[PDB]
Write a protein that binds this ligand. Structure first.
Ligand SMILES: *P(=O)(OC(C)C)OC(C)C
Length: 173
């Protein structure tokens, strides 16, 4: 079954998704979003919590489905700590880029999901010995949920994806 870190993310995403369904999306955003006024610049959870908000049933479900498989793989084969670093960096960076081009009003775990897709894939190609890899067919359906993100079927998913690849590079050495 699934490790403590994969578990918690899903829960928090769920609780927050529940929180969002009850209170309203603006209301939760008001507390969890990337900082949108300078009074909020010190509230350091905000650079991260944007990842926990999903806006539709299909948003959370796919992110969590992908998180479930990819996140859970890294944690089994490679450890809870590794998953934490990947999560922290990709949320910050994609969030930063997202915020920069579009604004502080966003959410979703897909920046992180992209990093995982890029990470697991490259790490399996360049370090097959480690027992990590993205299976062929999954590469296809992953390229889709990437394409889903890139044509709006916003921009900072390259950041998420980059971080994922960048880290897989380092560990292959
Ligand atoms: P992602 O969770 O969603 C894309 C699949 C559209 O969104 C960014 C803001 C992380």
């Amino acid at each position: 079954r699934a490790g403590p870190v994969t578990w918690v993310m899903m829960i928090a995403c769920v609780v927050v998704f529940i929180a969002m369904q009850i209170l309203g999306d603006q209301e939760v955003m008001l507390w969890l979003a990337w900082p949108f006024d300078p009074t909020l610049k010190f509230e350091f959870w905000r650079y991260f919590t944007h990842a926990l908000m999903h806006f539709s049933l299909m948003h959370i479900l796919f992110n969590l489905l992908w998180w479930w498989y990819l996140g859970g793989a890294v944690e089994k084969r490679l450890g809870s700590g590794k998953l934490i670093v990947i999560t922290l960096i990709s949320a910050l960076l994609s969030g930063y880029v997202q915020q920069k081009f579009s604004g502080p009003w966003f959410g979703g775990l897909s920046g992180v999901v992209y990093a995982l897709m890029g990470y697991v894939w490259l790490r399996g190609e360049r370090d097959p010995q480690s027992g990590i890899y993205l299976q062929r067919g999954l590469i296809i359906f992953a390229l889709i949920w990437i394409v889903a993100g890139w044509f709006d079927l916003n921009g900072a998913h390259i950041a998420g994806l980059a971080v994922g690849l960048a880290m897989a590079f380092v560990d292959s050495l």
